[PDB]
Amino acid sequence: EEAAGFSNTSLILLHQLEDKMKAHSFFVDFLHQVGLFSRLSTCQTKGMLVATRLLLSEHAEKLSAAIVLKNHHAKLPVLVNSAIQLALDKRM
Amino acid sequence: SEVDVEELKLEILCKAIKRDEWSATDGKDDPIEATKDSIFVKVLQNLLNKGIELKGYLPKAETLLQSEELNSLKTNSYFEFSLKANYECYMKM
Numbered sequence: 004e005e006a007a008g009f010s011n012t013s014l015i016l017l018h019q020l021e022d023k024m025k026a027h028s029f030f031v032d033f034l035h036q037v038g039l040f041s042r043l044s045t046c047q048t049k050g051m052l053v054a055t056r057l058l059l060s061e062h063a064e065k066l067s068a069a070i071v072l073k074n075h076h077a078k079l080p081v082l083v084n085s086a087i088q089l090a091l092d093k094r095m
Numbered sequence: 096s097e098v099d100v101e102e103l104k105l106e107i108l109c110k111a112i113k114r115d116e117w118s119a120t121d122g123k124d125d126p127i128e129a130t131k132d133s134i135f136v137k138v139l140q141n142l143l144n145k146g147i148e149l150k151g152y153l154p155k156a157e158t159l160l161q162s163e164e165l166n167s168l169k170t171n172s173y174f175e176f177s178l179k180a181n182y183e184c185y186m187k188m
Contacts, residue, residue, distance in 0.1 A: 015187070
């Protein structure tokens with residue numbers, strides 16, 4: 004499907020991540036139809052308390068809209084600030 | 096089928112990458128494929144509104160058979176990073 008192993012080094016990265024907000028959208032629909040109207044383990048994560056696991060679908064959606072927004076804005080200062088961040092978390 | 100159509104189809108798309116020159120700038124991929132890029136932008140004449148089956152009409156080009164020729168030229172290590180990368184946004188195109 005739109006899941007397919009698209010290369011991470013592809014120049015057109017943004018369109019590849021739009022495909023993944025659509026993939027995560029047909030994923031929420033293929034939960035909504037196939038029952039699964041239960042299950043909620045959010046509890047406590049990183050100082051955040053959250054009522055229901057279904058807030059984590061909404062939270063992974065909001066932070067997949069955040070990604071496309073800073074993929075839409077790509078300029079040398081932000082891409083430098085990114086390369087520093089990524090190299091602090093681990094090696095590339 | 097006698098004079099080899101799909102052999103030449105490869106010979107050309109491979110010298111279409113040799114002229115491109117796959118390089119690297121400061122440890123990052125350099126997409127030289129600017130001509131390979133442009134040729135795949137030139138195959139489509141917007142035949143979606145011409146009523147032609149443009150959707151699914153780039154399986155002219157080969158893939159695994161291509162890196163066979165890239166090995167002969169000794170250039171596989173340079174270009175195989177963006178050959179596949181561009182072949183992902185050519186399955187979306």
